[PDB]
């Protein structure tokens, strides 16, 4: 047998020998992150990760990936959030994200914490994942802005949220996308991402090269002509507007 690779639009992939029905089912299946090097390798059923052990893709020979397992016992499984459960392992970090970003005090005035790059990367680089509980637009839109600091629209049916107390990294650090602050001149964008542990979510992707220890920012993209937005954003929107005559 040969081997099949199935890529998502985001650059991640599933790879392995498929079974008789072309399904990613077996004991030597892997999800490979968009760096084409960090991998979760092990038991999958029809492409769902049952037990993925942290591995590094070392080479590919005739299309077949050759992995080395990382030391430790870092194991992961498909664990999609619900409306009330953000994660079965809130303190288990994503191994790809952990190498790319860290949380620290923001450089933006009075903005609390922010998300920073650990290393220099090029444009179009996935940096961080925005997982959270999955609730409805009705609930979010019909409640006060003070509850809506971390809400992210996923699609026409679902909003992802990281509600208190999970907005503190001491309580939740499985993903960190909710820590990226807003800018009207951002260095990153949100993009759809299909994650083997979190399921369909969004990620933070650079739109240009970024330096080590640079703060990562995204345009929150609130509706300016409904501005349906929190106060700090309205205050900052007028400034942005001033800057370009």
């Amino acid at each position: 047998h040969g081997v099949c690779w199935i890529y998502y639009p985001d650059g991640g992939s599933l790879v392995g020998e498929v079974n008789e029905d072309g399904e990613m089912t077996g004991e030597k299946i892997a999800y490979v992150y968009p760096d084409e090097r960090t991998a979760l390798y092990g038991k999958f059923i029809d492409g769902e990760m049952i037990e993925g052990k942290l591995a590094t893709l070392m080479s590919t020979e005739e299309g077949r990936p050759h992995f080395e397992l990382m030391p430790g016992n870092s194991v992961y499984h498909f664990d999609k959030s619900t409306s009330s459960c953000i994660s079965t392992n809130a303190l288990l970090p994503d191994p790809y994200e952990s190498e790319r970003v860290y949380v620290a005090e923001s450089l933006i005035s009075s903005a609390g914490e922010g998300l920073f790059s650990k290393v220099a990367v090029g444009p179009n680089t996935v940096m961080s994942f925005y997982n959270g509980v999955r609730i409805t637009h009705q609930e979010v839109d019909s409640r006060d802005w003070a509850l809506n600091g971390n809400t992210l629209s996923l699609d026409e049916e679902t909003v992802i949220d990281v509600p208190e107390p999970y907005n503190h990294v001491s309580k939740y650090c499985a993903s960190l996308g909710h820590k990226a602050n807003h800018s009207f001149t951002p260095n990153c964008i949100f993009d759809m991402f299909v994650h083997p542990r979190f399921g369909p979510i969004k990620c933070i992707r650079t739109l240009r090269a970024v330096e080590a220890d640079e703060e990562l920012t995204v345009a929150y993209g609130y509706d300016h002509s409904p501005p349906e937005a929190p106060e700090w954003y309205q205050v900052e929107l007028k400034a942005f507007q001033a800057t370009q005559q």
Partner: peptide, 8 residues
């Protein structure tokens, strides 16, 4: 929409 990144 009181959430980040909604498509209008």
């Amino acid at each position: 929409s009181k959430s980040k990144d909604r498509k209008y």
